[PDB]
Design an enzyme around this catalytic site. Structure first.
Site, short mmCIF file in Angstrom:
data_model
loop_
_atom_site.label_atom_id
_atom_site.label_comp_id
_atom_site.label_asym_id
_atom_site.label_seq_id
_atom_site.Cartn_x
_atom_site.Cartn_y
_atom_site.Cartn_z
N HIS A 111 -21.69 23.09 11.07
CA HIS A 111 -21.57 23.86 9.81
C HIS A 111 -21.62 22.93 8.59
CE1 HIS A 111 -16.95 23.61 9.98
NE2 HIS A 111 -17.30 23.09 8.80
N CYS A 171 -12.72 18.98 8.09
CA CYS A 171 -13.60 19.34 9.23
C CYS A 171 -14.25 18.06 9.78
CB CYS A 171 -14.63 20.41 8.85
SG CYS A 171 -13.87 22.02 8.50
N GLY A 211 -12.59 19.72 3.59
CA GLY A 211 -13.08 18.34 3.77
C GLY A 211 -12.51 17.68 5.02
#
Ligand SMILES: CN1CCN(C(=O)Nc2ccccc2)CC1
Ligand SMILES: CN1CCN(C(=O)Nc2ccccc2)CC1
EC number: 3.4.19.12
Lengths: 304, 304
Positions: B41, B145, B143
């Site tokens: 993603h 992830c 941020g």
């Protein structure tokens, strides 16, 4: 979102941990530049620890009696001096992994990461607080002595703690990196009992702000209070007195949340007086006091 | 003595964290050998996240659109392939700090350390469990992830988790390092509600053993029970069923403490039925389920 008891990344400190052996005693040392710091009770037999004269014990020790191992490479000791309750072993090699660092003596209520070590090897890392009675509630087995507490400010490691003692009550005492014990503790195996373990009130309030911020709000009441009123209740529950300095430090969390500090105090007062009634706040059933307001700003903003 | 929620030393993992940027989205990557792993993603705008066709979105991306930064040095991307919900970016340089590693898909109830990162930089480290509903209760801001979960076995890092999603309920979902989500979760911004968050019964029992070992004994009763009896009570309190495998795993703690596993079950039953009555166990007012029996053996023995 979510709020965790979070240690600093330990890698900068891993790179400083060495094994120090004097005769039969092995424990941990902190290698910064060409100096290895360790608890001076490395020169003691458990028998010595009953009534140790460190100066007398030290006369019998040479540089070659201090075995310093960094991984599987031995460090040459070219000098040593006893500074309070720490030994400083001068070695002929500067630690190539020495990070930017300071030694800071912290205040009670202040939080820090511990890297628990055995034979100069890190086992784990956890977040502590210096309790108001200058103990920490650590996890430390035999061989953990010389394990350090630290904060990191971007790339500077501020070492605040070196582990020395477990009291007969299973709480921990140790020094700053100048070898001065926090509180009334000495490196002697004797009756030392900690004082009252009070709750760090400012840290509880910061944690109540962290809860609201992360969506746990059930405990927000319609009431306010005053520092004096709050404190009459605080004292009865063995909470530290709250000062204007504490109120000032909570300011930013107050601003961000739009919850006045005294309103939150009055939420905290009802929690003290009425308990949790089987409810939880950020997955805890008691009031957490090992997050500082700075910790809460840090983790809710994502400082690296 | 003392018992702490303890993360592994994060240094081996710090040395693998990089920043991955695709257009406007920045998040974390894991650099092992000449491959950088990150959530797929990364190629999504928040708009994309409503109904993303990852294959279609990926057609428009070249190797040069993936900006990979390790500290302040850029890594050249020479290839990439989508494996489930992770991107593998091939880079022309092998990570010189690649530790010994495996990818392991953990079971629910299993614990692991998270190194929370922002822009490829570690902010902090904390100990989690994979909940029985395949969520984790993390601390993750925008941020974070690509932040990973791991275990360390001496010098081998087993990566078990990569962080992808926060559910509308503020719990976290992510993948193994093969990019397969734990539980029914997908990398889509939609109604995904977690199932029942059950208590990891075997972990609670291990933690009750850790308590006895560290001197907290008040909750030890005169009673025993049977797996079936225990389980009738467990189920009613949304505890996981206890199996013979669980009993077998607790064996060593049973041996060390001389408390039979079913006796401890019967202590746990009374705690469930009678609550703590305002008491605490290892400084907690609820029953901790994020220590495995292996965690308890490890920390009570001082494994490095
Ligand atoms: C107790 N004494 C103290 C003095 N002392 C040293 O070795 N000092 C030293 C320090 C830095 C470099 C070289 C020597 C011996 C033990
Ligand atoms: C979706 N596709 C998949 C294929 N692909 C690659 O780059 N593959 C690759 C892998 C390893 C080395 C060199 C090239 C482009 C994007």
């Amino acid at each position: 979102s979510g709020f965790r008891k979070m240690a600093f990344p330990s890698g900068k400190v891993e790179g400083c941990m060495v094994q120090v052996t004097c005769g039969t005693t092995t424990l941990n040392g902190l290698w910064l530049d060409d100096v290895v710091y360790c608890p001076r009770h490395v020169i003691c037999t458990s028998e010595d620890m009953l009534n140790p004269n460190y100066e007398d014990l030290l006369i019998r020790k040479s540089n070659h009696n201090f075995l310093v191992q960094a991984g599987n490479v031995q460090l040459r000791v070219i000098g040593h001096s006893m500074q309070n309750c720490v030994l400083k072993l001068k070695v002929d090699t500067a630690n190539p992994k020495t990070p930017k660092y300071k030694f800071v003596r912290i205040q009670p209520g202040q939080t820090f990461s511990v890297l628990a070590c055995y034979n100069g090897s890190p086992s784990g890392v956890y977040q502590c607080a210096m309790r108001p009675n200058f103990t920490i509630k650590g996890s430390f087995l035999n061989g953990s002595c010389g394990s350090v507490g630290f904060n990191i400010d971007y790339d500077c490691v501020s070492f605040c703690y070196m582990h020395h003692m477990e009291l007969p009550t299973g709480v921990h005492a140790g020094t700053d990196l100048e070898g001065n014990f926090y509180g009334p503790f000495v490196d002697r195996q004797t009756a030392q009992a900690a004082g009252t373990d009070t709750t760090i009130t400012v840290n509880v309030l910061a944690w109540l702000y962290a809860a609201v911020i992360n969506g746990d709000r059930w405990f927000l009441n319609r009431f306010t209070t005053t520092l004096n009123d709050f404190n009459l209740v605080a004292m009865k529950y063995n909470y530290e007195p709250l000062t204007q300095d504490h109120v000032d430090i909570l300011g930013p969390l107050s601003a961000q949340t739009g919850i006045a500090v005294l309103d939150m105090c009055a939420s905290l007062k009802e929690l003290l007086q009425n308990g949790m009634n089987g409810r939880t706040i950020l997955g805890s059933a008691l009031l957490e006091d090992e997050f500082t307001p700075f910790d809460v700003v840090r983790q809710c903003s994502g400082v690296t």
